């Protein structure tokens, strides 16, 4: 099945999920001189309840923090979006070296990692699974991580990783103050695109913050110790899990700021 190893990695996904070569694939290169400032874009309106986080698990492809998305306690609005997008999950992408770990790349700069906060349009769709197959279904906030001071909220995640080393393991995880994790400035770029993992559905309104947050090199390194293999199987480590940038194919990247 798919992954980030030689035989099953990003270059091979198109062999078995053909939309990998679609017209609205993510991530992308963000070229700040080509982006269009758009005065119609709104500031982000962010409400994240720390009690929404419930579980952290190892998917084999990243960790995911799952949020109880039963009602509208944690929602994203404003920005480019019409309507209210409910928080579902958070995960991270990184590389084998701090030099190059993000998925979006800004004028050639790859950051050490990139956080994705995944939301779905509950004003139009009845569930995440239905939302995930519609162009206006999902909204993902991407946040870059650069190496710097340890991050006290991220420490809560790294303290759990020993318990979820094997693919499929889960453990409880709550009181995660995602709002406080975000960087001081919420100025962003936005474009229409896709999931960056199979099934690569073109259902995502991407909202990429310009300002990175910090993580220490030691905290970042703990993520590379997760396994992409299940309990009792030949161990392989998830040292890298980012997809390369995909062709822009004439999409408009807009800026909320100039």
Give me the residues that bind Zn ion (CB under 5 A), please: 116, 196
Nearer Cβ to Zn ion, position 123 or 224?
Answer: 224
Residues 188-227 that bind ligand 6YQ (CB under 6 A): 195-197, 204
Annotated binding-site residue? 93? yes
How does 62-76 read in b/e, with b if 16+ C-beta sit within 10 Å? bbbbbbbbeeeebbb
# residues contacting ligand 6YQ (CB under 6 A)? 10
The answer to whether 61 is a known catalytic residue is yes
* Interface with ligand 6YQ, residue 164, by CB under 6 A: no
Contact 131, 149 (CB under 8 A): no
Q: How far is the CB of 241 from ligand 6YQ (least distance, A)?
A: 9
Site string for ligand 6YQ, 16-55 (x = CB under 6 A): ----------------------------------------
CA–CA separation, 135 vs 24, rounded Å?
Answer: 10
Specify the pairing of strand 53-58 against strand 63-67.
antiparallel
To ligand 6YQ, the closest distance from the beta carbon of 24 in angstroms equals 12
Report the alpha-carbon distance of residue 90 to residue 173 in Å, rounded.
12
Q: Strand, helix or coil at 63?
A: strand
Query: Is 196 assigned a ligand-binding role in the annotation?
Result: yes
Give residues 137-156 in contact with ligand 6YQ (rule: CB under 6 A). Answer: 138, 140
Chain position whose Cβ is nearest to ligand 6YQ: 116
Is 43 or 63 the residue whose CB approaches Zn ion more closely?
63
Residue number with the smallest Cβ distance to Zn ion: 116
The catalytic position among 7, 12, 61, 133 is 61
Q: Which residues of 171-202 are buried (b: 16+ CB within 10 A; e: fewer)?
A: eebeebebeebbeeebebbbbbbbbbbbebbb
Applying CB under 6 A, which residues contact ligand 6YQ?
A: 116, 118, 129, 132, 138, 140, 195-197, 204
Q: Please list the active-site residues.
A: 61
Binding residues: 91, 93, 116, 196-197
Binding residues for Zn(2+): 91, 93, 116
């Amino acid at each position: 099945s798919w992954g980030y190893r030689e035989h099953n990695g990003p270059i091979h996904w198109k062999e078995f999920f053909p939309i990998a070569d679609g017209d609205q694939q993510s991530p992308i290169e963000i070229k700040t001189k080509e982006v269009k400032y758009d005065s119609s874009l709104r500031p982000l309106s962010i409400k994240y309840d720390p009690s929404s986080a419930k579980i952290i698990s190892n998917s084999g492809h990243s960790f995911n923090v799952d949020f109880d998305d039963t009602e509208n306690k944690s929602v994203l609005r404003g920005g480019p979006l019409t309507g209210s997008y409910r928080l579902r999950q958070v995960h991270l992408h990184w590389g084998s070296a701090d030099d190059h770990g993000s998925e979006h790349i800004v004028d050639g700069v790859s950051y050490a990692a990139e956080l994705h906060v995944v939301h779905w349009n509950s004003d139009k769709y009845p569930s995440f699974v239905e939302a995930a197959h519609e162009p206006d279904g999902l909204a993902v906030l991407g946040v870059f991580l650069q190496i710097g001071e340890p991050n006290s909220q991220l420490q809560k995640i790294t303290d759990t990783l020993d318990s979820i080393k094997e693919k499929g393991k889960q453990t409880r995880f709550t009181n995660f103050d995602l709002l406080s994790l975000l960087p001081p400035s919420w100025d962003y770029w936005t474009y229409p695109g896709s999931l960056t993992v199979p099934p690569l559905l073109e259902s995502v309104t991407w909202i990429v913050l310009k300002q990175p947050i910090n993580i220490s090199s030691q905290q970042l390194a703990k993520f590379r110790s997760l396994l992409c293999t299940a309990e009792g199987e030949a161990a392989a480590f998830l040292v890298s899990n980012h997809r390369p940038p995909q062709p822009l194919k004439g999409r408009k990247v807009r800026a909320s700021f100039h």
